[PDB]
Write a protein that binds this ligand. Sequence first.
Ligand SMILES: NCCC[C@H](N)CC(=O)NCCC[C@H](N)CC(=O)NCCC[C@H](N)CC(=O)N[C@@H]1[C@H](O)[C@@H](OC(N)=O)[C@@H](CO)O[C@H]1NC1=N[C@@H]2C(=O)NC[C@@H](O)[C@H]2N1
Lengths: 60, 103, 44, 77, 91
Amino acid sequence: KTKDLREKSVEELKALLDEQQLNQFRLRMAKATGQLGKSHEVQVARKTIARIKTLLTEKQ
Amino acid sequence: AKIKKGDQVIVIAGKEKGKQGTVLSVSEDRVKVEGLNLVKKHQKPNRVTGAEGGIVTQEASLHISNVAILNATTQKADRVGYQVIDGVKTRVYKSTGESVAVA
Amino acid sequence: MKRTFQPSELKRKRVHGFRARMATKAGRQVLARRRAKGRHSLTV
Amino acid sequence: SKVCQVTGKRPVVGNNVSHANNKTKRRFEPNLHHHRFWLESEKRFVRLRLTTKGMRIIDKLGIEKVVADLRAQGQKI
Amino acid sequence: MNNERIYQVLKGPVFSEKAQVLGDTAGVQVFKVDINATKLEIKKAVEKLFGVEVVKVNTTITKGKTKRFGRTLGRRSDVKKAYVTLKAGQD
RNA sequence: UGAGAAGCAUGCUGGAGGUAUCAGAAGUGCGAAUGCUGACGUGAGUAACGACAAAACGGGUGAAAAACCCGUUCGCCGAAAGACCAAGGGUUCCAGUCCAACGUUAAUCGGGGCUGGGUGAGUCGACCCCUAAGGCGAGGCCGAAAGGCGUAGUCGAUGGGA
RNA sequence: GAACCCACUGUCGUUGAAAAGCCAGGGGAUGACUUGUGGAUAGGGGUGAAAGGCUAAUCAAGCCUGGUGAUAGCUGGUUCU
RNA sequence: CUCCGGGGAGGCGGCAAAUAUCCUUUGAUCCGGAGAUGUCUGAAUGGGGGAACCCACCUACUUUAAGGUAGGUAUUGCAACAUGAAUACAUAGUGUUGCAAGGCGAACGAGGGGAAGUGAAACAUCUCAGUACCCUUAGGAAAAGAAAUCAAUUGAGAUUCCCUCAGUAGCGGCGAGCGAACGGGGAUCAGCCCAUUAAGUUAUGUGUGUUUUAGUGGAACGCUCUGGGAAGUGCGAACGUAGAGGGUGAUAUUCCCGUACACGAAAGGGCACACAUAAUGAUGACGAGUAGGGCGAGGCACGUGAAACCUUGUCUGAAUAUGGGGGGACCAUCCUCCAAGGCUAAAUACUCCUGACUGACCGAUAGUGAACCAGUACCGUGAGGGAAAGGCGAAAAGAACCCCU
Ligand SMILES: NCCC[C@H](N)CC(=O)NCCC[C@H](N)CC(=O)NCCC[C@H](N)CC(=O)N[C@@H]1[C@H](O)[C@@H](OC(N)=O)[C@@H](CO)O[C@H]1NC1=N[C@@H]2C(=O)NC[C@@H](O)[C@H]2N1
């Protein structure tokens, strides 16, 4: 996924960061309510946010 | 001198010495071979999940130094070497130099 | 009967506390000795 | 502290020695005191804490030379 | 306020008899929130992420327990709870 | 078996090391030091079970009830043996469940073990503004060094301020 | 004369309920009074209506760590044949 | 988390199993190198404070409400600039910007202060001892160092360290004790400058060499007996530039990991040499309040002694190369050196650390206080004091099921 994020530009990356953070909140809420059986998506989103931040500081 | 998850091996030491089978897993210095070195586990019944217990038979791991790959041509124990054929490293039989047969 | 220890957190901190030890060179030597000995707790 | 600005003299340690040769620690102190000197090149009085040997050196070399020398060593006169 | 803090403020719901009764009868939602969250922060977060109207927010902090698990003494973290009163009939 | 410190053989237990001869080096031999550490005896199933306000019975649960629960009686405190706040303590608070250890007895009970809950403020308190005793203290004065004192200031409630 | 602050007599207790108490009596109780909170004085120093009293259950020189394995013409002990 | 390199069948750290979701030959986990992020306290530095907390100000951008993002705001010293009293010029004072410092940490170095127990069979001179301790402050070492030095056939030739001289000469309530030098043998060797200013040292840049931080290949054993298990018994083979070591169900050169040996680097670091540019050496140009003297002390093996020589608290005070210092009171003669200005590597001292190797060192009351969740539990207001506690089995195969309770 790192390559896919890398071809994108700064504006698209900053938008993707907001979408991923909102998705992280939704996933946390679902897990807390107990309606989330598959649990690896929280780790995937948590790593995706870090990758986006790394690429952002690399490009700036 | 590697032993991999799909090899055909023969046991050279222990109570199973002289028998052969397919290795099921390699972890650290221990190897499990299907159908060999069986132990009887007295499994207690599980209150939460049901699945009442009983006496079950399952494989137990042997030390990696207690098995050797089986040479298919000669049906004897053998050691493993490495040769760089073309550009790739390949395991070979030390007795005859032929490439190890993938199972 | 009245015994010797009459607890008070403010007095404890003002007499034996971290800043009280830092205020003098002898207190800093006390902290150095306790760090060298490897105490899990430096001060009260 | 008791340091002469001109010579750098300071109290030193020694012994009182009695007739029975008992030895006790003591200090020798400089003949220190304050004195105002007229600096003509600056039209003002400069107050120094110095010894009588400092006054003798000032008599020998002139106040201007001594003041310039002390300034050259980082003394704020 | 930024969306980062907005998405970080709320941690999860509270499931207990008191929380259930408050939700059933009084139109009050009980949340676990970040230990450093303020009442205004919680109000804004709830309003943005659930599209409701908040009347007032009440917060409380419960200190963590210290228990002897096995041979070692451990301590749980402090938990801050937020009582959020909704307007009229919402949620 | 030898004069002795000791040696040799072998039954049982034990389950992986031991070591002739001749030389070489010593943390080389314990009963005492009111010796040091751990374990265990005698006293002895002896003294004692912590305010002489006081208990009795019916039913319940339970393996087991003088001590727990419910009920009917009796008694004690009532300027504290009742109800609160500060200090101090820190989950001892509430519910379910368990009884090995803790409770000077037993315990189904508990401030005990385990699991889950519980502390909602513009008006209460703290924080905040203000200062006392006192502390620290830019420059400064003094002192072998460390440092002592102190000006402008800055802190400091046990007091003033919705 | 109660609260509060003391501590004159006696029995009990003395491996105590308590490393200074209980009980029955006793003294002061608007004053040189009692008391909370927060401060100051540090060891040949402090403080003392003065007993060498008190200075964290320790006082004719507090406690801790170093000099230090102080010195002891003294006492004890010193291991197989 | 990203990039580069290595590696090639498994993995999601340990106590600590088990389960679920999963990841991975489109290269996972893991190893090495380089980057990104890096909350709060603590020199803590925006102010304060009972450490991990309370309260702020200014500027720019952004939001519409009671905010967000980024930056700046400590003190002291130095420099530049501006401003500026008594007081006329000035000066003190004040402000801004830039640069630097503070704190921690083993031992060794240098410097400022400096005991007593003890011994003398008592004790004061003396000893202990410039030791313990307190304080300031460097470097990889530091300090010292190129003769106003020794020697005494007129010879040696800077400093530092070791052996000897020698427990000698001496000092000493001539007690207890303290204790040299000359000369000789070694280690290491090196000199260069004071105003157009030297050797050297430190930074930076480039080049060459070397080393270091992952890794790859790596020989050769069968049968038989005892046995739960063979590496052990018996018989016969093979390798050796590899018979170091560890593991494997008992004791293995040939089962496994390795070992000898042969290779290996995208990238980064250390050291050596050479060149180039800065700086520094270097406010110093042959040394006057100096040498010497009186008084009081200190250091010299040397305690006032016949006491030379060095340092100076106090009072004084030259000559200045036809000059001056020393040769242990002092004089003469001879010999020797040139103070009152500097820089300088090696031989020497040490171990908080990193890697490799070793032990007639210990083996759980031993060895670190600590083999184990130890400076912990526990004790104390505090400084501080300070334990006990290792072993199922080769493999959990850790005892399904029945019975008493
Ligand atoms: N005919 C009569 C029949 C009667 C009938 N049957 C009924 C009856 O009457 N039955 C009686 C039952 C007997 C008894 N009650 C049962 C019992 O007691 N169970 C105890 C069960 C829990 C037990 N406490 C767990 C435990 O201690 N774990 C230890 C422990 O973590 C730790 O040890 C230390 N040092 O602390 C560690 C050391 O590294 O080892 C662990 N363990 C390990 N095992 C592993 C291994 O082997 N290899 C690999 C690694 O996994 C190893 N670690």
